[PDB]
Design a protein around this ligand. Structure first.
Ligand SMILES: *Cc1c(COP(=O)(O)O)cnc(C)c1O
Ligand SMILES: *Cc1c(COP(=O)(O)O)cnc(C)c1O
Lengths: 396, 396
């Protein structure tokens, strides 16, 4: 009974992918990638995780099932990462972490637990946000409304429009925040704006849900967590879905976590058991290899030092490319003020190009970008920067 | 808003697990395990998969995302395994395989695709069946009804009761079949009964869904697939959810597949895209490591030969333990006819013990079994067999 099944829509970036690797003209640059690439245009496996994998290969004696919530060093290590090494949330044990199939997995499992065990009906997502947000919440039956965020004109956070649309949210609604490196704009709240949002969130009764996929990409591990940390000193309950796909280069091993924080130990345990019921009814218990690698890097001082250096080198490469982009455009010369690029954090930002301009970029030059003008800065190299900027100057 | 959350029910086997590893009296035998154990009571990682993992460690250059459906050798290898190396289904390409987070993952993703894209409302599951079946289908909004299967008295397949309850199923209902080694009874249809079921299934318009977790444990790889194969020569459409957790000893790496078969190439592609939409909204794209290991063993003749020997040794160990169990009980002596144990396939079977007897087994002897009298034959060793049988004889 499958003949009247309508084909699923062409996926936003995976379409571009197929179109690109069909254009036989190799001056082509794909900036619509979604993954990190180094100066060589390669997405390598990190040295710390290969050292990790050799260790595991030498020491694993069984592939027997992990518990519903995954390996128990993993969840003490990401909540130390998230909340700080001596957080009251950890000492009073009101946080529980379930290891999930990446950050998307963490969001579907939070959405199913919420849909089955609480009275939430709406989730507020930023306009724009990472596109797969709507699908995950909708599939668990939650409805997505969106709140204002990006100011197209100044290319900044329209904070007043943000605070103003978020008042049609009632008490008991969930509001999704990107912890650092907002996808897709790269504009983040400043710590002071985070603190007002945290204060407004208690007054209004929002359930905060942090999507935290880029820890370490804006400024550093601790610094990037201070927004979330302003929101867990103020609130009895919150959920954070984190990913290790990007900061560990472990994309395909699916490594993420769903952390539940509640008022005290008794209620977080009673709620976490229902979150465990949600995992049993989906994939039963999580993938060992990627989370195992993360646990031994983060618990070993020597391996952790290496990973931290490797993550800082990624972060700096992105910051150098954003810088090189802005002034190589100023050398190729056009009426521009692309300096907002320097102000945004992470791999993505809107270039400000129109869809007709990204179309003739693709068609006439072989530069591939997402139709919204979204560009991934990690697809730029010292070598492809000059043809890239010539192409952009020529279409402006 | 978590304080009135009711704790999730005590999990059927994981409870026994905690109770067992709290009984400080080491003549204790846990037969309620659910996993394979060798003669040493260990669940080892196979030699073929460690050889596999060394190869992958030496040759992987990226952990970049797999496509929604996973690695493309994996899905040609399990549908060759499932349908036979030159099946018409494969040559006419009407089957598509998505690599999923184990066999449970394959069932949730089949359930979500069905619930969102077709008009199914009921799934028929055997009484008894693997317990997590109800939860997976219920969470996607499908309702579970059950069909008769096990005859408690003769300890056999009550085939007529089976065919008779399955007539309240209407056209468009899904009926779940265990491909071989029925969990939890170990009684399988004979090929002739499979063929009548296949013929009755077309006449009535059932969507067959095969749960195939034990390939290679009843008789051998090809032999164990002939039931499913009687049901894919007769039917335009079916879904099979397979697992690699047990036959590859890869439990915690989550390795499974959801294969969709439709009337022809065009419709299976159009349906498969919606199945891909279901993955995007859940965990996005699957775990590479376990499926990667399975792909290189199954594609390498030398590694595949080793795995096949290793799987036959598991199968034979279980068959020898079922045999040793029945006659060591006949040596310890009681009014019994435990010979039905020899007739059942796989790791599980109902011992026929009452819940009061399994209770005094636990309490007075330290032998742990599931309250229904369910016993896992792979928890028996040549060494623990004699105290085990004494304990059972003493409670009969
Ligand atoms: C990458 C990302 C995720 C999910 O990552 P996984 O690959 O599923 O671990 C979630 N939210 C945002 C904003 C992301 O960028
Ligand atoms: C083991 C099993 C599954 C699922 O196995 P995974 O560990 O999730 O791969 C599904 N059905 C039956 C009958 C099983 O025994």
């Amino acid at each position: 009974m499958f003949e009247n099944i309508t084909a699923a829509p062409a996926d936003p970036i995976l379409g571009l992918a197929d179109l690109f690797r069909a254009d036989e003209r190799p001056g082509k640059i794909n900036l619509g990638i979604g993954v990190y690439k180094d100066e060589t245009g390669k997405t390598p496996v990190l040295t710390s995780v290969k050292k990790a994998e050799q260790y595991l290969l030498e020491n694993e004696t069984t592939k027997n099932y992990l518990g519903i919530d995954g390996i128990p060093e993993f969840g003490r290590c990401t909540q130390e990462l998230l909340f700080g090494k001596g957080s009251a949330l950890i000492n009073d044990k009101r946080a529980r972490t379930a290891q999930t199939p990446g950050g998307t997995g963490a969001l579907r499992v939070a959405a199913d637990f919420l849909a089955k065990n609480t009275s939430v009906k709406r989730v507020w997502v930023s306009n724009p946000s990472w596109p797969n947000h709507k699908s995950v919440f909708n599939s668990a039956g939650l409805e997505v409304r969106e709140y204002a965020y990006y100011d197209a004109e100044n290319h900044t956070l329209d904070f007043d429009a943000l605070i103003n649309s978020l008042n049609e949210a009632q008490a008991g609604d969930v509001v999704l925040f990107h912890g650092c490196c907002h996808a897709p704009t790269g504009i983040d709240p400043t710590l002071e704006q985070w603190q007002t949002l945290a204060q407004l969130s208690v007054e209004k009764g929002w359930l905060p849900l942090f999507d935290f996929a880029y820890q370490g990409f804006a400024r550093g591990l601790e610094e990037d967590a201070e927004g979330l940390r302003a929101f867990a000193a103020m609130h009895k309950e919150l959920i954070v879905a984190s990913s290790y796909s990007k900061n560990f280069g472990l994309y395909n091993e699916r490594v993420g976590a769903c952390t539940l924080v509640a008022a005290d130990s008794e209620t977080v345990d009673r709620a976490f058991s229902q979150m465990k019921a949600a995992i049993l009814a989906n994939y039963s218990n999580p993938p060992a290899h990627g989370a195992s690698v993360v646990a031994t890097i983060l618990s070993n001082d020597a391996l952790r030092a290496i990973w931290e250096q490797e993550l800082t080198d990624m972060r700096q490469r992105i910051q150098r490319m954003r810088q090189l982009f802005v002034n190589t455009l100023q050398e190729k010369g056009a009426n521009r003020d692309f300096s907002f690029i320097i102000k945004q954090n992470g791999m993505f930002s809107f270039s400000g190009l129109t869809k007709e301009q990204v179309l003739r970029l693709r068609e006439e030059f072989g530069v591939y970008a997402v139709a919204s003008g979204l560009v991934n800065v990690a697809g730029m190299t010292p070598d492809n920067m000059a043809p890239l900027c010539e192409a952009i100057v020529a279409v402006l």
